[PDB]
């Protein structure tokens, strides 16, 4: 099995949320993932797996798994709290049929406190923590950036940080442990820039008034004499400047870029160059540019686009394209993702592991 | 040092956005992080740090730095492609010294192709793999959900888990490699439930009429009372029937949840009941609840919420509220973040590192 995490043992419990995410990645790399569903796929985030049933709430079930988490190097769970524990593979029960397991725990609201045993989604671990607040336009109520930022970005990938630093503390102690990875927390960390600026005056709370966030008429989207959009990100002065000089508007007769009094009519400069030439236009112009204008692309033309091909950052499979693993390796190349392998019986996979 | 990597040794080349994210989140779990920065020269993200100055263009410069490498487990850099290369600091350079380090390169079009030498920010790599169309409401143009997704979700983060899982790989091998984090791959990767129900017929390209976009009446955030908002994520129809309970509405007499023809409709209706409260007492309401229902804090407000409070997730800096490390662990807890160690001199850290 290629990439960089061959050799590791991963047990994934069926949940819904992030946990599959992060199951995927580390599969992705050529980590060994069974996955324990229910007796009772077409999901894509199911590659890179093999799927086998069990009843948990059944005592050959509850046996099996344990059997599998102790020949293993990683327990994936996603359920509320206390549902491990109920189920007879809480931490402590893990620990003692094999005290090198990681034990990951992805959740929203974390293992205590007051909502911890309240349902959600990504748009609620996000209300709480200043996120969601700050994404959107500021005549606009908030609007959920997809899932990305609580479920994956805040929530798989700290998972996967967690499991990953653990595995490097358990080379030197012997001993796993616990990784507790909150969406509240994680996403908490992801804005970390934000925090930070917010202490130094460098952001607001007001809600699309900063550099990142809309607000700033060189950091925003513009429409294009075709109705479609490029995205422009020229914060810095000499981009900014390529970036006026490609659309033909002289710097002497605009505002300064950051005299923010006057973005307003900034804005309404940039608004009528960019809509006067359709959004193909744009991308050509400012091919090789260094102005930070890039067209913006529905997911349906990624597959055209040369800089998509070329680095083969998609992969087909059926039902079209999927991404390829993230991020890359020189010598322990990851590889092209295999479908979820056909329901093994859990026993051929036991076997199979000494 | 506490947390899970203790006497981890990390030399990071100083640059701006994601690559010192990553450096933090190392050093926040207890790495040993060290920052090579530009003799030229309160920034939070700078934390779990020291600091060390040094013109990586003086052949003074180039040695020292070159000496800590050769001490170190993993070298972060976030220039384009060829720059250290040039410097003397590149790959190959880097094994002469260090056959077992970790060559962590953070870019966001990545390493080649057409667009590797261009310029760009995070709004730039999202616009282009599909991402930045799909979010925003339908009748206005896309709306970057800041730098969240190429820069940290999409990037330093997928630099992380690249670096860590090349220590798995140096484990069975004993030698390092390089770590090609591109915002453009990472970003698609963290898209890829998109790219999945893509697949099954379950998102269109459309902006605004699917189910975690901002469409779904369900799935958005909608205006209180006193003009603040709550966010509504009631997804499985359980939670949702709790929801429109708590809201005061009788099921039978509005649209079905997933009828997507009338979302407009259905929406009218609940923009209308929650419109008729306050913030606070909806959350009040739909405390315990499975409803799926949260006021909408920003950022000033979100040290007065207990379920923030009661579980650690900030603590206090000089100035305002920084996020403890994430994740937490059981037996090696992260602790609390120190400040950034003012000037050294690269030498100190030489000594201290074995010598």
């Known amino acids: 099995?290629?990439?960089?995490?061959?050799?590791?043992?991963?047990?994934?419990?069926?949940?819904?949320?992030?946990?599959?995410?992060?199951?995927?990645?580390?599969?992705?790399?050529?980590?060994?993932?069974?996955?324990?569903?229910?007796?009772?796929?077409?999901?894509?985030?199911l590659r890179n797996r093999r799927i086998v049933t069990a009843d948990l709430k059944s005592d050959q079930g509850l046996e099996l798994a344990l059997k599998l988490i102790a020949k293993a190097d990683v327990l994936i769970e996603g359920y509320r709290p206390g549902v491990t524990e109920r189920l007879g593979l809480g931490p402590e029960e893990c620990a003692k049929v094999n005290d090198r397991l990681i034990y990951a725990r992805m959740t929203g609201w974390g293992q205590t406190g007051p909502?911890?045993?309240?349902?959600?989604?990504?748009?609620?671990?996000?209300?709480?923590?200043?996120?969601?607040?700050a994404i959107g336009r500021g005549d606009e109520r908030p609007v959920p950036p997809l899932n990305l930022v609580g479920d994956f970005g805040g929530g798989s990938m700290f998972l996967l940080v967690g499991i990953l630093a653990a595995l490097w503390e358990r080379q030197s102690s012997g001993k796993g442990q616990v990784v507790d990875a909150a969406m509240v927390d994680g996403s908490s960390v992801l804005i970390q820039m934000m925090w930070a600026m917010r202490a130094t005056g460098m952001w607001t709370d007001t809600r699309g008034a900063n550099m990142l966030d809309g607000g700033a008429p060189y950091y925003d989207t513009y429409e294009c004499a075709?109705?479609?959009?490029?995205?422009?990100?020229?914060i810095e002065p000499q981009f900014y400047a390529a970036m006026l000089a490609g659309l033909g508007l002289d710097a002497a007769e605009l505002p300064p870029q950051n005299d923010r009094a006057r973005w307003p009519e900034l804005r309404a400069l940039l608004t009528e160059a960019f809509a006067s030439h359709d959004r193909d236009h744009w991308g050509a112009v400012?091919?090789?540019?260094?102005?930070?204008?890039?067209?913006?692309?529905?997911?349906?033309?990624v597959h055209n686009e040369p800089h998509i091909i070329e680095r083969n950052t998609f992969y087909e499979a059926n039902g079209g394209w999927q991404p390829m693993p993230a991020p890359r390796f020189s010598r322990t190349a990851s590889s092209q993702p295999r479908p979820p392998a056909a329901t093994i019986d859990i026993e051929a996979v036991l076997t199979d592991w000494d």
């Not at 075709?226 to 020229?234: F, I």
């Open 1 to 45: 099995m290629a990439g960089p995490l061959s050799g590791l043992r991963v047990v994934e419990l069926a949940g819904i949320g992030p946990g599959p995410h992060a199951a995927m990645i580390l599969g992705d790399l050529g980590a060994d993932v069974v996955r324990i569903d229910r007796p009772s796929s077409r999901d894509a985030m």
């Open 115 to 133: 909502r911890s045993q309240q349902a959600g989604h990504d748009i609620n671990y996000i209300s709480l923590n200043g996120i969601l607040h």
């Open 226 to 234: 075709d109705g479609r959009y490029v995205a422009v990100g020229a």
């Open 286 to 301: 400012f091919a090789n540019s260094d102005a930070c204008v890039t067209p913006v692309l529905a997911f349906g033309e």
